[PDB]
Amino acid sequence: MVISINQVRQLYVAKALKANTAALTTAGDIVPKADTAKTTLYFQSMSPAGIVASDKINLKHVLYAKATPSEALAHKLVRYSVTLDADVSATPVAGQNYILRLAFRQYIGLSEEDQYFKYGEVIARSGMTASDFYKKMAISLAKNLENKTESTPLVNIYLISAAAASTDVPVTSATKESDLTATDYNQIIIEETEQPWVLGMMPQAFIPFTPQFLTITVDGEDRLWGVATVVTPTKTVPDGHLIADLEYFCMGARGDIYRGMGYPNIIKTTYLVDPGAVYDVLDIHYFYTGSNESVQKSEKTITLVAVDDGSHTAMNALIGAINTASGLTIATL
Amino acid sequence: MKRVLNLGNLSRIVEGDPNEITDDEILVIKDKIIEGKIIDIQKRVDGKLVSLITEKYT
């Protein structure tokens, strides 16, 4: 990624809270250190290459400080519930083609001027029920999608038998009408799909979409046959891949800005965050003001990360330490 | 012995889907049992199809 800065921000991973210096044995350790008067604050971190200290924090020049619970950076995958509007007809008309158009915006490019469309077509018959329609439409969608020899499709297409209403039965281009057997399928689902992520080159990004039904002739009039309802998501992209590219970036203000540019000729940088875990976060914003004529402020940030076991034990213990040391009052998430 | 209606309104006498005919079209239905009969003639009244031929009773 590439983020914006209040002229600088630096990141320090906190895998273990220690009580004092000389207890920093393993890399990624952290201990907050402050004067007894509570004038300044700084963090002594155990880098892979040794021990290191954060910049100093004049506790009367600190602007804001707040911690994030690691549930605020998870991206919920958008999922639609496509159905038939009983307004038009609770069942398929016997001779019309039910096309469904998936409108994808900010496809490969960044702009919404970058649009991609994928169709799922179906024709109905005299005896076609709503379930038979849903499964044939899901199959058509998955087969027009998921022709990828590349990866998981732009969206994940599921179905739901009214007997469950909770389990989502997948539908892939390899799925066959024979393995979908239930007779009470009551909707077609389409869930946003997590895209690839490689450290420092491909930031966490998604392709939003909209199911755009087309018009069928019901009673001589042209009418839209579907209802693209947005259901509460059930699956999220965890924080691990944002903190990873964040450290990748904030470890170039403290270290090497060249990252692979002369490939053999490199300053290898050992990062301490695994993109497979989840991390709470704590930002502290503060400035440095000079003397008589140098009153201009130099604002800076010091952000820390700590894994979330679901109860926020690590960061909350870290919060308590910083508050007992600096006398501050940061809220324990 | 004039035409019952003009041609612009006879042109719109069609054969096929009951769902696809507009308010401007008359629908014919060829009887499937007999080979040259008609079973109903319909046109849209209020979005619904209704028989033009008067119903007979005894």
Tab-separated table of C-alpha atoms in Angstrom:
chain	number	residue	atom	x	y	z
A	1	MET	CA	0.000	0.000	0.000
A	2	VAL	CA	0.836	3.694	0.043
A	3	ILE	CA	-0.755	5.713	2.837
A	4	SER	CA	-0.892	9.392	3.722
A	5	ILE	CA	1.201	10.663	6.619
A	6	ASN	CA	1.065	13.506	9.129
A	7	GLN	CA	4.640	14.083	7.942
A	8	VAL	CA	5.677	10.752	9.483
A	9	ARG	CA	4.361	7.601	11.105
A	10	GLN	CA	6.326	4.678	12.516
A	11	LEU	CA	5.169	1.187	13.450
A	12	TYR	CA	6.378	-1.130	16.208
A	13	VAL	CA	5.089	-4.674	16.655
A	14	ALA	CA	4.239	-5.827	20.183
A	15	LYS	CA	4.378	-9.608	20.520
A	16	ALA	CA	5.202	-9.537	24.242
A	17	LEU	CA	4.776	-6.900	26.933
A	18	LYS	CA	7.824	-6.746	29.193
A	19	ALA	CA	8.204	-4.944	32.507
A	20	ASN	CA	11.643	-3.404	31.952
A	21	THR	CA	14.624	-3.182	29.675
A	22	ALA	CA	17.034	-6.140	29.907
A	23	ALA	CA	13.921	-8.351	29.630
A	24	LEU	CA	13.797	-7.755	25.855
A	25	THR	CA	15.148	-11.110	24.679
A	26	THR	CA	13.037	-12.091	21.662
A	27	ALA	CA	12.388	-9.941	18.617
A	28	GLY	CA	9.171	-7.946	18.593
A	29	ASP	CA	9.192	-7.407	22.352
A	30	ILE	CA	8.107	-4.028	23.681
A	31	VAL	CA	8.249	-2.046	26.914
A	32	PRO	CA	6.881	1.494	27.441
A	33	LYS	CA	9.356	3.723	29.273
A	34	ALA	CA	8.587	7.107	30.814
A	35	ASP	CA	10.062	9.519	33.318
A	36	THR	CA	8.784	9.466	36.882
A	37	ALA	CA	7.475	12.998	36.325
A	38	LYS	CA	5.572	11.710	33.259
A	39	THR	CA	7.134	14.256	30.894
A	40	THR	CA	8.137	12.023	27.971
A	41	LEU	CA	7.275	8.569	26.671
A	42	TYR	CA	9.011	6.150	24.331
A	43	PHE	CA	8.977	2.472	23.422
A	44	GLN	CA	11.974	0.147	23.700
A	45	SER	CA	11.499	-2.558	21.071
A	46	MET	CA	13.526	-5.696	20.400
A	47	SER	CA	14.292	-5.607	16.695
A	48	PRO	CA	15.573	-8.758	14.973
A	49	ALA	CA	18.952	-7.007	14.815
A	50	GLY	CA	18.878	-5.879	18.454
A	51	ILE	CA	17.014	-3.498	20.748
A	52	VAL	CA	15.764	-0.130	19.530
A	53	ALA	CA	13.808	2.813	20.914
A	54	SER	CA	10.904	4.829	19.570
A	55	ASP	CA	11.014	8.580	19.206
A	56	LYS	CA	10.248	10.532	22.359
A	57	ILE	CA	6.743	11.787	23.095
A	58	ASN	CA	6.324	15.057	24.973
A	59	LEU	CA	3.215	14.100	26.931
A	60	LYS	CA	1.983	17.709	26.973
A	61	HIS	CA	2.262	17.894	23.162
A	62	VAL	CA	0.209	14.764	22.418
A	63	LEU	CA	-2.891	15.430	20.322
A	64	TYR	CA	-4.912	12.200	20.231
A	65	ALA	CA	-4.480	8.548	21.152
A	66	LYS	CA	-6.952	5.729	20.547
A	67	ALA	CA	-6.892	1.968	20.049
A	68	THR	CA	-8.727	-0.046	17.408
A	69	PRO	CA	-10.378	-3.398	18.267
A	70	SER	CA	-9.342	-5.222	15.046
A	71	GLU	CA	-13.036	-5.664	14.236
A	72	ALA	CA	-13.114	-2.220	12.588
A	73	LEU	CA	-10.650	-3.114	9.810
A	74	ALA	CA	-12.277	-6.375	8.722
A	75	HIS	CA	-14.059	-5.961	5.394
A	76	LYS	CA	-17.442	-7.672	5.232
A	77	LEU	CA	-18.025	-9.361	1.883
A	78	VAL	CA	-21.188	-7.982	0.302
A	79	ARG	CA	-23.771	-10.657	-0.480
A	80	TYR	CA	-27.039	-10.201	-2.357
A	81	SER	CA	-30.168	-12.348	-2.118
A	82	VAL	CA	-31.695	-12.580	-5.588
A	83	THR	CA	-35.283	-13.811	-5.777
A	84	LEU	CA	-38.468	-13.499	-7.813
A	85	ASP	CA	-40.837	-10.643	-7.034
A	86	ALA	CA	-44.279	-12.123	-6.417
A	87	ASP	CA	-45.423	-8.658	-7.504
A	88	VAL	CA	-44.788	-9.647	-11.123
A	89	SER	CA	-45.167	-13.386	-10.530
A	90	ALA	CA	-44.215	-15.740	-7.696
A	91	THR	CA	-43.264	-18.317	-10.353
A	92	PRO	CA	-41.580	-18.136	-13.763
A	93	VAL	CA	-43.667	-17.226	-16.762
A	94	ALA	CA	-43.760	-20.095	-19.216
A	95	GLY	CA	-42.029	-18.564	-22.242
A	96	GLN	CA	-39.688	-15.718	-21.284
A	97	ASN	CA	-35.907	-15.528	-21.012
A	98	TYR	CA	-34.823	-14.476	-17.508
A	99	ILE	CA	-31.467	-12.794	-18.052
A	100	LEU	CA	-29.484	-11.497	-15.076
A	101	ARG	CA	-26.686	-8.977	-15.591
A	102	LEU	CA	-23.906	-8.568	-13.017
A	103	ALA	CA	-22.533	-5.023	-13.260
A	104	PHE	CA	-18.943	-4.906	-11.995
A	105	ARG	CA	-17.387	-1.500	-11.313
A	106	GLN	CA	-13.783	-0.566	-10.615
A	107	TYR	CA	-12.773	-3.721	-12.387
A	108	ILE	CA	-9.104	-4.032	-13.148
A	109	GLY	CA	-8.615	-0.291	-13.284
A	110	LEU	CA	-9.312	2.011	-10.363
A	111	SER	CA	-12.115	4.125	-11.795
A	112	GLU	CA	-15.787	3.282	-11.954
A	113	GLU	CA	-15.250	4.047	-15.640
A	114	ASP	CA	-13.810	0.508	-15.628
A	115	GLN	CA	-16.879	-1.679	-15.995
A	116	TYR	CA	-17.351	-5.394	-16.548
A	117	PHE	CA	-20.579	-7.269	-17.204
A	118	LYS	CA	-21.416	-10.962	-16.878
A	119	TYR	CA	-24.724	-12.568	-17.778
A	120	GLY	CA	-26.702	-15.502	-16.479
A	121	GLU	CA	-29.470	-16.456	-18.896
A	122	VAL	CA	-32.418	-18.807	-18.458
A	123	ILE	CA	-35.639	-19.582	-20.306
A	124	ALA	CA	-38.640	-20.870	-18.383
A	125	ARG	CA	-41.184	-23.527	-19.283
A	126	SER	CA	-44.749	-24.553	-18.530
A	127	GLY	CA	-43.950	-26.564	-15.407
A	128	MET	CA	-40.815	-24.828	-14.170
A	129	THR	CA	-41.042	-24.080	-10.451
A	130	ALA	CA	-39.110	-21.400	-8.583
A	131	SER	CA	-36.476	-23.847	-7.332
A	132	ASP	CA	-35.781	-25.342	-10.759
A	133	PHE	CA	-35.436	-21.783	-12.047
A	134	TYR	CA	-33.042	-20.761	-9.280
A	135	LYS	CA	-30.728	-23.732	-9.816
A	136	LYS	CA	-30.652	-23.363	-13.605
A	137	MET	CA	-29.924	-19.653	-13.164
A	138	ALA	CA	-27.201	-20.299	-10.589
A	139	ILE	CA	-25.582	-22.864	-12.889
A	140	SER	CA	-25.743	-20.450	-15.824
A	141	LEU	CA	-24.157	-17.711	-13.719
A	142	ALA	CA	-21.401	-19.987	-12.433
A	143	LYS	CA	-20.702	-21.259	-15.950
A	144	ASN	CA	-20.509	-17.742	-17.386
A	145	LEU	CA	-18.317	-16.952	-14.403
A	146	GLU	CA	-15.735	-19.433	-13.095
A	147	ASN	CA	-14.471	-20.315	-16.534
A	148	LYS	CA	-11.274	-19.082	-14.912
A	149	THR	CA	-8.221	-21.211	-15.306
A	150	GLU	CA	-6.906	-18.419	-13.104
A	151	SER	CA	-8.653	-18.295	-9.726
A	152	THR	CA	-11.883	-18.177	-7.741
A	153	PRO	CA	-14.490	-16.205	-9.716
A	154	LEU	CA	-15.494	-12.565	-9.341
A	155	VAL	CA	-18.346	-13.643	-7.046
A	156	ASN	CA	-19.359	-16.800	-5.194
A	157	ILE	CA	-22.776	-18.131	-6.225
A	158	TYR	CA	-24.778	-20.172	-3.720
A	159	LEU	CA	-28.329	-21.413	-3.205
A	160	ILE	CA	-30.583	-22.005	-0.216
A	161	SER	CA	-33.142	-24.720	0.436
A	162	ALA	CA	-35.920	-23.400	2.662
A	163	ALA	CA	-35.398	-26.396	4.958
A	164	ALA	CA	-32.058	-24.937	6.088
A	165	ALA	CA	-32.225	-21.188	5.343
A	166	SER	CA	-28.718	-20.958	6.831
A	167	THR	CA	-26.396	-23.308	4.941
A	168	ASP	CA	-25.274	-22.071	1.526
A	169	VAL	CA	-24.902	-24.829	-1.074
A	170	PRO	CA	-22.141	-23.736	-3.493
A	171	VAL	CA	-22.478	-23.714	-7.261
A	172	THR	CA	-19.365	-23.964	-9.438
A	173	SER	CA	-18.879	-24.464	-13.166
A	174	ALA	CA	-18.123	-28.064	-12.172
A	175	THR	CA	-21.506	-28.410	-10.453
A	176	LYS	CA	-24.186	-30.440	-12.228
A	177	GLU	CA	-27.976	-30.268	-12.159
A	178	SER	CA	-27.863	-33.782	-10.677
A	179	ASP	CA	-26.090	-32.970	-7.398
A	180	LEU	CA	-28.554	-30.136	-6.675
A	181	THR	CA	-31.557	-32.179	-5.569
A	182	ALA	CA	-33.632	-30.142	-3.108
A	183	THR	CA	-37.015	-28.883	-4.299
A	184	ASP	CA	-37.397	-25.817	-2.041
A	185	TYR	CA	-34.586	-23.581	-3.289
A	186	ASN	CA	-35.862	-20.077	-2.567
A	187	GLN	CA	-33.114	-17.680	-3.687
A	188	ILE	CA	-29.825	-17.192	-5.507
A	189	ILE	CA	-26.986	-15.644	-3.520
A	190	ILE	CA	-23.996	-13.749	-4.875
A	191	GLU	CA	-21.204	-12.905	-2.442
A	192	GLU	CA	-18.346	-10.462	-2.883
A	193	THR	CA	-15.052	-12.295	-3.313
A	194	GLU	CA	-11.697	-11.601	-1.688
A	195	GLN	CA	-9.032	-10.785	-4.267
A	196	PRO	CA	-5.335	-11.684	-4.217
A	197	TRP	CA	-2.848	-9.875	-2.006
A	198	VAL	CA	0.945	-9.835	-2.256
A	199	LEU	CA	2.988	-7.769	0.191
A	200	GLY	CA	3.874	-4.376	-1.244
A	201	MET	CA	2.464	-4.870	-4.755
A	202	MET	CA	-1.261	-5.776	-4.544
A	203	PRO	CA	-3.218	-4.064	-1.752
A	204	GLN	CA	-6.417	-5.482	-0.323
A	205	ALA	CA	-9.079	-4.507	-2.839
A	206	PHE	CA	-12.469	-5.750	-3.990
A	207	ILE	CA	-14.619	-5.470	-7.110
A	208	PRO	CA	-18.130	-4.233	-6.218
A	209	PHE	CA	-21.065	-5.356	-8.301
A	210	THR	CA	-24.807	-4.946	-8.755
A	211	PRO	CA	-27.293	-7.559	-10.025
A	212	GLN	CA	-29.228	-5.813	-12.809
A	213	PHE	CA	-32.288	-7.783	-13.870
A	214	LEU	CA	-33.737	-7.280	-17.342
A	215	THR	CA	-37.316	-6.853	-18.484
A	216	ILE	CA	-39.720	-9.682	-19.256
A	217	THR	CA	-43.165	-9.450	-20.825
A	218	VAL	CA	-45.748	-10.733	-18.339
A	219	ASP	CA	-49.096	-9.217	-19.359
A	220	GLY	CA	-47.965	-7.440	-22.510
A	221	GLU	CA	-46.148	-5.018	-20.229
A	222	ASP	CA	-42.388	-5.050	-19.695
A	223	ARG	CA	-41.374	-5.665	-16.090
A	224	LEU	CA	-38.338	-6.604	-14.019
A	225	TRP	CA	-38.538	-10.090	-12.551
A	226	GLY	CA	-36.045	-9.993	-9.668
A	227	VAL	CA	-35.250	-8.410	-6.310
A	228	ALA	CA	-31.570	-7.783	-5.524
A	229	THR	CA	-31.782	-7.578	-1.749
A	230	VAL	CA	-28.621	-7.025	0.296
A	231	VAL	CA	-28.388	-9.444	3.213
A	232	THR	CA	-26.204	-9.020	6.268
A	233	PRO	CA	-22.767	-10.458	5.389
A	234	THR	CA	-21.477	-13.603	7.061
A	235	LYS	CA	-17.787	-13.638	6.051
A	236	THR	CA	-15.063	-11.017	6.407
A	237	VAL	CA	-11.518	-10.328	5.243
A	238	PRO	CA	-9.429	-10.139	8.452
A	239	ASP	CA	-6.946	-7.423	9.342
A	240	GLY	CA	-3.818	-9.488	8.748
A	241	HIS	CA	-3.187	-8.190	5.235
A	242	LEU	CA	-3.508	-4.482	6.059
A	243	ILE	CA	-1.125	-4.521	9.027
A	244	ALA	CA	1.330	-6.416	6.820
A	245	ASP	CA	1.475	-3.762	4.099
A	246	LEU	CA	1.402	-1.130	6.848
A	247	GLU	CA	4.586	-2.442	8.474
A	248	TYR	CA	6.080	-2.890	5.003
A	249	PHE	CA	5.532	0.843	4.524
A	250	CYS	CA	6.266	2.261	7.980
A	251	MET	CA	9.518	0.261	8.146
A	252	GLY	CA	10.920	2.478	5.395
A	253	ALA	CA	10.714	5.651	7.435
A	254	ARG	CA	12.915	3.937	10.027
A	255	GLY	CA	14.928	1.892	7.529
A	256	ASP	CA	15.459	1.218	3.840
A	257	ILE	CA	13.249	2.854	1.225
A	258	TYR	CA	14.774	0.767	-1.543
A	259	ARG	CA	12.830	-2.508	-1.366
A	260	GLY	CA	14.029	-4.924	-4.041
A	261	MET	CA	14.956	-2.257	-6.583
A	262	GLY	CA	18.494	-3.534	-6.988
A	263	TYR	CA	17.404	-7.073	-6.466
A	264	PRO	CA	20.614	-8.941	-5.555
A	265	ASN	CA	21.817	-5.723	-3.904
A	266	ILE	CA	19.366	-5.254	-1.043
A	267	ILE	CA	18.987	-4.373	2.611
A	268	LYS	CA	16.944	-7.365	3.724
A	269	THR	CA	14.289	-6.169	6.166
A	270	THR	CA	12.843	-8.726	8.576
A	271	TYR	CA	9.189	-7.927	9.181
A	272	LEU	CA	7.525	-9.106	12.375
A	273	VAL	CA	3.829	-9.232	11.397
A	274	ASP	CA	2.247	-12.357	9.924
A	275	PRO	CA	-0.561	-11.640	7.412
A	276	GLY	CA	-2.390	-14.715	8.684
A	277	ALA	CA	-3.323	-13.314	12.093
A	278	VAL	CA	-5.459	-10.425	13.363
A	279	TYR	CA	-4.099	-7.376	15.173
A	280	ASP	CA	-5.586	-4.647	17.269
A	281	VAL	CA	-3.952	-1.267	16.681
A	282	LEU	CA	-3.035	1.783	18.750
A	283	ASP	CA	-2.135	5.159	17.254
A	284	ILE	CA	-0.617	8.075	19.159
A	285	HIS	CA	-0.407	11.497	17.525
A	286	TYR	CA	1.907	14.163	18.888
A	287	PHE	CA	4.082	17.018	17.704
A	288	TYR	CA	7.404	18.718	18.350
A	289	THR	CA	7.486	22.493	18.763
A	290	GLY	CA	10.761	24.368	18.977
A	291	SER	CA	12.001	27.470	20.739
A	292	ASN	CA	11.660	31.236	20.478
A	293	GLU	CA	11.280	31.668	16.696
A	294	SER	CA	10.858	27.962	15.793
A	295	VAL	CA	7.244	27.619	16.917
A	296	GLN	CA	6.147	25.630	13.864
A	297	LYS	CA	4.854	22.228	14.887
A	298	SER	CA	6.223	18.924	13.626
A	299	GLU	CA	3.437	16.372	14.014
A	300	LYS	CA	4.184	12.672	14.173
A	301	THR	CA	2.478	9.347	14.777
A	302	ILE	CA	3.558	6.229	16.656
A	303	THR	CA	1.357	3.224	15.891
A	304	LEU	CA	1.565	-0.181	17.563
A	305	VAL	CA	0.007	-3.520	16.646
A	306	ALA	CA	-0.897	-6.499	18.810
A	307	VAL	CA	-2.717	-9.742	18.095
A	308	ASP	CA	-6.379	-10.094	19.061
A	309	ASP	CA	-7.334	-13.368	20.740
A	310	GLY	CA	-10.959	-12.211	20.548
A	311	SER	CA	-10.774	-10.582	23.992
A	312	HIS	CA	-8.009	-8.014	23.325
A	313	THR	CA	-5.786	-9.174	26.190
A	314	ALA	CA	-2.481	-8.150	24.605
A	315	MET	CA	-3.300	-4.569	23.649
A	316	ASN	CA	-5.287	-3.965	26.836
A	317	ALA	CA	-2.300	-4.969	28.961
A	318	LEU	CA	-0.199	-2.719	26.730
A	319	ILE	CA	-2.725	0.076	27.281
A	320	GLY	CA	-2.531	-0.350	31.047
A	321	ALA	CA	1.257	-0.129	30.944
A	322	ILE	CA	1.285	3.066	28.871
A	323	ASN	CA	-1.351	4.612	31.133
A	324	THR	CA	0.449	3.745	34.369
A	325	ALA	CA	3.704	5.049	32.873
A	326	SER	CA	2.571	8.234	31.114
A	327	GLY	CA	-0.406	8.919	33.379
A	328	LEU	CA	-2.559	9.109	30.236
A	329	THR	CA	-6.064	7.615	29.986
A	330	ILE	CA	-6.480	5.493	26.865
A	331	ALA	CA	-9.688	3.488	26.665
A	332	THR	CA	-9.267	-0.279	26.934
A	333	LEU	CA	-11.055	-1.828	23.969
B	1	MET	CA	-70.599	-5.271	-46.009
B	2	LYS	CA	-67.643	-3.284	-44.708
B	3	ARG	CA	-64.656	-4.773	-42.929
B	4	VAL	CA	-65.425	-5.200	-39.238
B	5	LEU	CA	-62.380	-3.042	-38.469
B	6	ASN	CA	-59.582	-1.293	-40.324
B	7	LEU	CA	-56.358	-3.055	-41.267
B	8	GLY	CA	-54.181	-1.271	-38.718
B	9	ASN	CA	-56.338	-2.977	-36.087
B	10	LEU	CA	-56.641	-6.268	-37.987
B	11	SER	CA	-52.884	-6.403	-38.588
B	12	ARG	CA	-52.510	-6.781	-34.814
B	13	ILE	CA	-54.433	-10.080	-34.737
B	14	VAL	CA	-51.653	-12.466	-33.752
B	15	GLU	CA	-51.029	-16.042	-32.636
B	16	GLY	CA	-48.806	-17.083	-29.752
B	17	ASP	CA	-48.016	-16.175	-26.165
B	18	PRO	CA	-50.886	-14.881	-24.000
B	19	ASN	CA	-48.263	-13.077	-21.895
B	20	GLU	CA	-46.558	-11.162	-24.722
B	21	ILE	CA	-49.577	-9.545	-26.411
B	22	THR	CA	-50.040	-5.833	-25.726
B	23	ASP	CA	-53.311	-3.945	-25.304
B	24	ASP	CA	-53.203	-3.190	-29.045
B	25	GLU	CA	-53.289	-6.830	-30.202
B	26	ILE	CA	-56.062	-9.397	-30.565
B	27	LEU	CA	-55.134	-12.945	-29.572
B	28	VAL	CA	-56.330	-16.001	-31.476
B	29	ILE	CA	-56.130	-19.562	-30.183
B	30	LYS	CA	-56.316	-22.391	-32.711
B	31	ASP	CA	-58.129	-25.371	-31.220
B	32	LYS	CA	-55.749	-28.302	-30.809
B	33	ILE	CA	-58.432	-31.018	-30.724
B	34	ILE	CA	-60.079	-30.006	-34.010
B	35	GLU	CA	-57.969	-29.045	-37.022
B	36	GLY	CA	-59.690	-25.873	-38.246
B	37	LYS	CA	-61.617	-24.483	-35.286
B	38	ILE	CA	-61.031	-21.667	-32.802
B	39	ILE	CA	-61.286	-21.987	-29.031
B	40	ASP	CA	-61.079	-18.356	-27.930
B	41	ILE	CA	-60.355	-14.814	-29.095
B	42	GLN	CA	-58.879	-12.490	-26.490
B	43	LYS	CA	-57.674	-8.930	-26.049
B	44	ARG	CA	-56.302	-7.197	-22.974
B	45	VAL	CA	-58.911	-5.187	-21.061
B	46	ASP	CA	-57.153	-4.128	-17.834
B	47	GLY	CA	-53.965	-6.137	-18.107
B	48	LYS	CA	-56.115	-9.288	-18.088
B	49	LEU	CA	-57.242	-11.350	-21.065
B	50	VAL	CA	-60.984	-11.601	-21.705
B	51	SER	CA	-62.977	-13.358	-24.405
B	52	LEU	CA	-64.546	-11.137	-27.052
B	53	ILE	CA	-67.208	-13.732	-27.881
B	54	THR	CA	-70.293	-13.542	-25.687
B	55	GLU	CA	-70.770	-16.486	-23.345
B	56	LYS	CA	-73.715	-18.740	-24.175
B	57	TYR	CA	-76.065	-20.436	-21.717
B	58	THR	CA	-79.173	-22.613	-21.798
